Amino acid sequence: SMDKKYSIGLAIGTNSVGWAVITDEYKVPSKKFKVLGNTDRHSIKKNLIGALLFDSGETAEATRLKRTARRRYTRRKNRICYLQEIFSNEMAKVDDSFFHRLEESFLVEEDKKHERHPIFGNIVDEVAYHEKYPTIYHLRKKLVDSTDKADLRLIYLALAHMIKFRGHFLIEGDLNPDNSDVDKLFIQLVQTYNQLFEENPINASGVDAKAILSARLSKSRRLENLIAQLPGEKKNGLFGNLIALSLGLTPNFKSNFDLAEDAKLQLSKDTYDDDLDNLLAQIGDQYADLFLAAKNLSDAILLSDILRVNTEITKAPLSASMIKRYDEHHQDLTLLKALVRQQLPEKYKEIFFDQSKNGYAGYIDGGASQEEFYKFIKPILEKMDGTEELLVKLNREDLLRKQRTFDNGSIPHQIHLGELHAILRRQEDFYPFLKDNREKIEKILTFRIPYYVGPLARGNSRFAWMTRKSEETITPWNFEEVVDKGASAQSFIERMTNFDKNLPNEKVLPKHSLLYEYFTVYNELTKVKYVTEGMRKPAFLSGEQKKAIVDLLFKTNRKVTVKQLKEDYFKKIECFDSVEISGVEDRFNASLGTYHDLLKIIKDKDFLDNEENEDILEDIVLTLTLFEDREMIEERLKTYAHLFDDKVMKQLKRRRYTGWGRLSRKLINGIRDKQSGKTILDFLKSDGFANRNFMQLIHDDSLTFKEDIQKAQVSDSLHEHIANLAGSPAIKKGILQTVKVVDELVKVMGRHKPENIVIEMARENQTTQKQKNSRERMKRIEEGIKELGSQILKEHPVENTQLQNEKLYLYYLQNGRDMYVDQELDINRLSDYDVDAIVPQSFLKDDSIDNKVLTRSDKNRGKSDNVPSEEVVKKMKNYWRQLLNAKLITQRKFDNLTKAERGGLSELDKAGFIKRQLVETRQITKHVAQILDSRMNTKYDENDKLIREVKVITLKSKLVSDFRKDFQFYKVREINNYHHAHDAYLNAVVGTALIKKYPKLESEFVYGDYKVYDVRKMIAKSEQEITAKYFFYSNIMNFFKTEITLANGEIRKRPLIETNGETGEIVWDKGRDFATVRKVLSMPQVNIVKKTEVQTGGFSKESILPKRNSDKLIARKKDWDPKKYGGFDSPTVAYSVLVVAKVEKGKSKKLKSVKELLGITIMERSSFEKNPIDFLEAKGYKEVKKDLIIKLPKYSLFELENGRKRMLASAGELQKGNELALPSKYVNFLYLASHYEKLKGSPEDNEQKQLFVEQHKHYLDEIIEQISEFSKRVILADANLDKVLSAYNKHRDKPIREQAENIIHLFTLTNLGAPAAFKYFDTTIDRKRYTSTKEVLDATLIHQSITGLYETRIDLSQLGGD
């Protein structure tokens, strides 16, 4: 040939990028490629098709939490250093090596430069100290309460313990009932609850919550005792489950919110914060304050239980309480030993000595948690007499407690400040420097760097923005007069603002913006319809009615419901009697929450409604979103001191808001439609007959909004464009690889650009697989069957796992009746019945339940090629309505069933099916297309219009997935990785065929600005009309088929050679072109490349292990020998290095030559990269040959004998390097055989397919020989293959479907990558590992470019010599 035009297909994913080059005839070209290196291979022919595989891109989060933990340790460390600075000179006069002894307290005695007893320096005073003060809290109480002069070392220790473990900062200011007491925090919980459920409040008037909740009963008992005081409230209702959350139980909120899957929550679980986020995702952000208030009360109960508060008043309530716990632990322990010794003396040893058991010895000495200890003794207590008290204490979770323990995070710093301050006042007269530093020392404990300041950097931190107004070290004491608080806060606001996607350069509003919330109510309010006595059609809400509703319902209540709408407004303002509401279910989801927060706080309804003040209020909400530092809130509200009273001024600051929305003020109430001068929010209020919302108004091409949005999105560099994407970091990695593939392919093709780039992008986060939707299926039936009042679930038991049978799902959805005739179906004879498409396959390929029905015979739909008949519609409409009101059919499905009442399928309907087929809805695919398009089309013409040389086309995956199933180009991902490449080829085929047949449809699926054609004008009014009108049967993939069968069994034939009539170009030859596709998919040479990468991240496993004299442990500090101190195990190899050098083999120091593989640990990496020969020489090697030091990152590829390949997993393990190209004929057999049951299609061919698997049962033996010849050659797991070969024999007579399903498991023996366990029926095959890398050192290392087309082959057996 001579034609040089080509097109590129791509399949972007998070672990793979498939790519293919095709020609105008859909063939994949083949080119010779230069092979560089030192071997005898100087060129290969390669097919231009393949896929790049890579490890997932990871988020910066784990890195971030480790960064913040480091800052916290650094700054806690410094608080202690500040204290010691203040103590040093006087401590020196008292004990001049005291601080030395604490510094070295960790060292073994051999290494201590001082005497081993930290506090006093001799054994007698230390032993006596500990007997007098068994815990640090005895020292703290004594120092708080006594008036004696105390040793300065003991004073230091008590201050240091409060300053190093200073407690939480969740409460602002001094502690008082309203921020700390159980009763006040309980009230706030019910106030919050009554705010969200005005119709059904909690009335807690006489309810002594402090006493009920603070008492010394178990958690479940306090829940009962509380709920017992609230008539109307079940223990497991919403309020009960909130109280259970507050008490530390684990309520299930599922049934509360009518969820399909249960929502268990526990405030103490490490998972809690995003377990709550996943709950709030479903039920609504409106409930966040409810769970917050539950959380606050939780702290107040826990702290109440920690402070055994009483009227033996101390200034040291916390230390006092811990002493009490110490003493009670002692008493119960003594009694436990006595009871054991008397009744179970053989268990004494175990419980008190055996620290590998979860008894008392494991509890104190063996790592057992309190929870674990309790689970171990409880059966033992229950066995003994006199254990009733102890068991009460246990089931109260108050037996043998320690003082340092998990509750303590609910201790406010203000408590440690209390004791800290008392102590200083005691001793400040015996030690003047304590008096002179008292406020310095309390500042060390109380000071806290504000969020809005950030790290206190000085130029060398990419995370910092803080601003100085004096170049000197910032301390807790000079902070306010050294930090420029104002300028730092300014920089904070800039960095923390998100910009509007729809219209960059505009900040987004707070999620609690009054405008956002007005906008959100009016956008919900505009789709609501109604009917009353004396009305033709369901009318929309007049803008004058929307405006009156938001003024009398939404500006008076928080939740407005269909009741107060239908009653308080319609039947009380508009003189109606009964109004049908038909756009809004139980109530309105949106709310003017912020309006009512401000109404309640500001108590000035006129002020709030004066849309003159709207900037003041939005700036207020803005400040309470950006900030929590009350000192910065005070400064940023100072201007409105004239506007508000000190009583409402105070209450404002204490109100917090968090969250951003998606939109900017300019978008909502900025840009105006040219002709109308209406902003978007202007439209949501008034719009006449057609009442459009937001997603319509943007999408609507009849206005100026969509154009200006595009004109807006205008955006420099490449990594800029990729950072700026709304996308996961995995997808951004895959996108960047995709760009690199396109560039390399352009090079390969003579630096000529392609005609088209066809893109398809995987959907992310398809993690759960199979169960989640099958509980939804059950949820829908249970609500719907009940809504009908049907007895169908008692007559026919419910089990959500056979709801995955679609026939059985539809049976229940249809209340067990024919969807097309008023008759019953037999649940036991579903096999006799037909599932039928409401809208036939010829207009659209919609196989969801939304478009399916179960009828005894699909001929009950009628004789049309359309939606079912007018006759069916008149006979069944009223039954369909019942099913609709009961939510057993969607609204959409109701409209399709009844379409014959409205003439049937209109051109408008068909035009929408066409849009549905072509238009990729996802934003991320549009931004990928723009990056590629901006990269390919760089030149402009004589009129300054961009010259679009390359068309970049986005395909919905459904097109190619449907193509595969229609023409039996089946895919089986388990066999090998080729399917990634095949998908890219198939996108190229379909996308380029589409763009040939349907040029006028360009704007729908090619990036750029094209003529936008009214698609209705392309739709023939009749089949006889067939001229320039593309479609009668709306399914755009019809031209591939030779026959299509209509919904009434009529068959329409198409030509073998499909052409574009307007342009003459051939688009598809059903002889040639399918054979081309089949031939491509069967090619064994596909370039599969696994991207090689250096490993980053943590140095090693994290457990701090006890000491061993195993030299394998890594010291935690430079001078801590792990043989004395413990350390870390299992470091991580950044990359391996090939080293050729000499070593010594004996006492002679004679030099043996060596060629080894050395793993460089992440920790060693900088050291090695700075002086590689110094590094290697210090490891043994001598005479190192620097020029042969080959960096070998993970997945470096080697080829051995017989095309056998290995990949490098580390310096001491290999992975499988080969792909098993199973012939295309065995692929479709495996798919058909193992889906023999679940077939999905016409019985005429679904029977034809089944005979195909019957008549090719011998492929079973052929496929096994394929597996076996590949394995003997490149797997080299002999014993394993012997085991699978006999296991295939033990089952040769099991059914074909079953043998095929298990043969698919067999491919993990052959897969690329790490060897993995698998099963063949019951036989289990253990993975054969490649634990030796020696053989790799004489193989061929293959450097591959990203497409694998360009390679350098290095024969390593030529190294090791001169």
Partner: protein, 86 residues
């Protein structure tokens, strides 16, 4: 039982780096456990019939399989995880 994120959490608590891969609609999802941080990697991929958590439990319930000494600890740790789910 326990779900995939529970299992990942439990494995991490045993001080193993572990990654979920292949969560595209394109790729087969695979749990990968870095057994030793030196190239030994235990991979459980998801099948249509059987899930990762199901494969994990049926593989580690009976503890070690005596195949590789450098994995005896790793099998003990994974077994304790199986017990948890009850």
């Amino acid at each position: 039982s326990m779900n995939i994120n529970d299992l990942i959490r439990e494995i991490k608590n045993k001080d193993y780096t572990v990654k979920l891969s292949g969560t595209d609609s394109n790729s087969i999802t695979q749990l990968i456990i870095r057994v030793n941080n030196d190239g030994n990697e235990y991979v459980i991929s998801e099948s249509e019939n059987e899930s990762i958590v199901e494969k994990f439990i049926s593989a580690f319930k009976n503890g070690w399989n005596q195949e590789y000494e450098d994995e005896e600890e790793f099998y003990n740790d994974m077994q304790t995880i199986t017990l948890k789910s009850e």
